[PDB]
Amino acid sequence: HKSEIAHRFNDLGEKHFKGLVLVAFSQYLQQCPFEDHVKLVNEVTEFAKKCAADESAENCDKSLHTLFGDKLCTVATLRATYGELADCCEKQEPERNECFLTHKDDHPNLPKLKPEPDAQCAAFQEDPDKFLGKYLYEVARRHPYFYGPELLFHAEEYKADFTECCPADDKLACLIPKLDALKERILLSSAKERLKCSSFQNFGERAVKAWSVARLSQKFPKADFAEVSKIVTDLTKVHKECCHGDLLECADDRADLAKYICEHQDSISGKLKACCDKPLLQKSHCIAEVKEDDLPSDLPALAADFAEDKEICKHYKDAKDVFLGTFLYEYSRRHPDYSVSLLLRIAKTYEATLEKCCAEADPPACYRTVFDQFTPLVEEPKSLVKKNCDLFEEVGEYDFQNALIVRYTKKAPQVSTPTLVEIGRTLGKVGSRCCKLPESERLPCSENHLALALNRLCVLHEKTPVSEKITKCCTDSLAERRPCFSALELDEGYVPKEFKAETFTFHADICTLPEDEKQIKKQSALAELVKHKPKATKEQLKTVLGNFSAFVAKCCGAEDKEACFAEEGPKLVASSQLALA
Template identity: 40%
Template sequence: MKWVTFISCLFLLSFTESKYLSRAYREAEPPTTIKHVSVLSDEHLEKICLVLFSQFIQKGTHEEVHKLVEDTLALAKKCTADEHSDVECTKPLSTVLLDEICHEEGIAAKYGFAPCCAQADLERHECFLAHKNGSRYYISPFPKLDPEATCKQFHDKKVEALNHYIYEAARRQPFTKIVTFLHGEKEYEEVLTECCQVEDKHACFDDKVAAATKRMLKAIGVEKHQCSVLRKFGMESLQGLKIAQMSQKFPKTNFQTIKDISGKIGHIYEECCRGDTLDCMLDRKKLTDYVCSHQDTLSSKLKHCCEGPILERGECIAHAENDDKPADLSPTVREFIDDQAVCQHYAENKGVHLAKFLCEYSRRHDELAPVMLLRLAKGYEEMLEKCCATEHPVTCLQEGEQLLNKHFAESTAIVKANCDLYKQLGSYLFQNEIIVRYGRKAPQLTSDKIRALTRRMVGVAADCCHLDGAHRVACAENHVDLALGFLCYLNEQHPVNKQVGKCCDTYTKRRECFIGLGPDPDYVPVPFNTEIVHFHADYCTAKPEEQQEKKQIMLFHIIQHKPDISEEQLATAIVDFTDVVTNCCSKENKEECFNTEIPKLIERTKAALGEQ
């Protein structure tokens, strides 16, 4: 609750004005009509409409969606030639798209949109957004590609094949940015171009398509995480992250501009997170246009982005290198510590003072992750509350500064220790270590979910541990933030336990909270399931990844059965199990060996755990 109070204080005053100015500006400006998007190529307009219709009519067939797209493209050509030729030409683009759905015979009734179509424009739009369903099994899982059939379609009807990919992806992710699908489709085309030319198409598909899918799902995961921050902790928290990010990206830019850009980004996320992906795209383009038209004062690293294709500029800017720091930028923010008037500034306008601290600290420390910068800002706010009530606040603040430095040193040490362990053990054994670590904290998770969580933790190490010290910490903070966000998402769907829920109720201190957790004190251990441990002969001929999965399921079950098992007891059980499996897989009659030796192994394990 204290964190919510802090972040609200931090940004409520500083963003209220720009928030309402933005809304008034949007209402005053002319709507984006179908003619306004004629600056895009027919191909891009077709893909944008395809994404939007697929996200609205998620259970519609590809043929039904294609018909709506074709009708919209025909209207676009008509309006471009003569904007007075049809009443639809002057309507907002979002209205035109919903008109197409509502006027298409049978579509509205077939998919439950008739009540929406009976409403006035704004209410109709809200009704359509409310129908979007992002749950995992609302649409059947993405169909597995048949390499031969896919390559034949790609060769014979390339555009249709790529459009079908967009359709299948977009209808499963109705809250995802349009540009994410366009980038994914571009990668998909590159993969098919390569794989359809090689002899072993199956191997190429297994490798390249899986990698491209993983990258796209990762991008979608980042978007969902930002939306979860917005949903659970409010707009102020999301804008706080953006202030930190924009201060790092544009270190020469003044505070007011950083604040305004961050506010606009927050509004864009608000649109996408509620499923309004068209306005999200249009407002993102407006912000991109603003940034590119002011790049001389914002950053020297944007030229190549602003000269690129219209729809790619926003993503390019988001991932662009941080600009060089001003030559005259002081290395520290002493005015927030040593100034005798610091408590007066804080008392006069807490929100602005804390936001300026975050901005100034962030522009000097591009090696720190935004979530860590927010954590430091929270620490600074706590210092002010404590020190400004004392007789000598400056002396107190200087002492508190040492605590902030100590916190960063501790974070660096934790990352180094985990990276050292990852390099020593390798991916598989490191994942086992994390399964044990988080299995104790959250034994109520299923084996599938604990493995999904710990795969993300291994991904943190794989992506970050090869970087230099400073960048390694920032990378790890960002990636762990996503991984713990996934755990908290699981907790939202099905509460894990009280201590996990408590950690998820914080944001900036989430990582520290999880690190400090021990075994769940309220957990009732599950009975020992001999079937999970009883391996059979087919294990010996299984693929390595299948063998690893089975062993990890067994490992997690042991933790679920005895969360307080000692490291020594666990190591003994693992060595004993490994010896039995190695021995039985070398025998001619493997099944007989497993049937004989596994029961003995189970008895030895129970005895070692003091259960006999």
């Protein structure tokens, strides 16, 4: 007590306190070795215990920021590895931490993490703490904005894959499909929490609260506006702190909110009963990803209050954030069939139909049909989702991914080929995740997951800005980002890329690659086709990539793969310019 450091240490416990302070330090210094962070973890941790014992020991009075920040300025070769971070060390808090966050790196391009079941199981055995703590470090620097408490959860069950399939008979066919499943849920968690951190950075806490109201209202329609307002206030603080690097306060404020949600579960949702009977970290996760509660029979008509009342302009002018807050709570809770972005688009439209109407002579007759200005906003997303699932169901993940790589390469021919491939592929996964779902939960799954995919494209675009069309879609409006991108067409001020034969030249190296890595090189080539002939129809490119695949399939199954690529490759590179006029 009387010390911020000692206090968390006490409540969170050493294991987690360390766990979070390692993740925190990994995210900030992505370049440093694993053992250089352990000693910063152990030096800080030592200080927590020393402060815990004696709360008037030197500098124990200082803030987490000053402590974590002072410890980030004592590391080896900070100027050599991170010349940018050195300058941050000159400034004091909070100026320093903001500077620190500035130089976080969203695409550091480190080796992809490979399941190596021989060694990893062996390292887990000599030191389990080390092998698992090394997994915290690894994902923490590849995802500088991951949800630290949610990582400790992913790191407690990465261990429960090695408690199962380390002593077992088959060391890969027990382990790989679970470490490959962990990875697809890592990539999803990171995306969700990058979109929360991105929302603060570009749009603010008003935007993150509005999103939360919509989402939580949909999940907890039984809860009243005071419960939702409270959980949103609390959940927002949890995310603001996690995104700014206060992973200690983030883990305590999140556990307090779990404690609360669970104490009040009968008033909030009947779905929570399952989540609240579980251990600490399992509780927070089960709540974060919980099924939506059944729509309540006693849901009120909104016509009366939001369209029919004659003193709405008074309600609205007297306190707007509140009245609009209430609207969003009410419309969201009765529309779980809707996407968060769509609900916020509708809230933004409801708002604009009062700002205008309340200046006209008779407002009530102006906003009486406000609700039928929502129908058009609902049709558009529902079309695209049916348009995209009808194509997906017909041609599969690969051909759908290929179709989207052409769509987005035409809208943004200046974005790099890896970025276009990753986004097209990330978007292609959407069809796999949402189209098979009950069509009831199809529009929400599709749009909410397009929001994660587009947000990454924006994160990358901040780092490496190439296109003014992509800037406007990423920065103007959070609600309208997907509609903004959907609306983009081919940039006709684009100069088609000077044809380089080496780009469309394949060799036998590709025949060794796993299926996934083989597609990326083919999809990489597709993007480069669209760049060279932007006007080429999607039907021309699908045919020319077909000719490329056939060509790869054949030569990979030749006695002389090397000679086959040598003879056929050039013939195909030349015939493809003429197929794409």
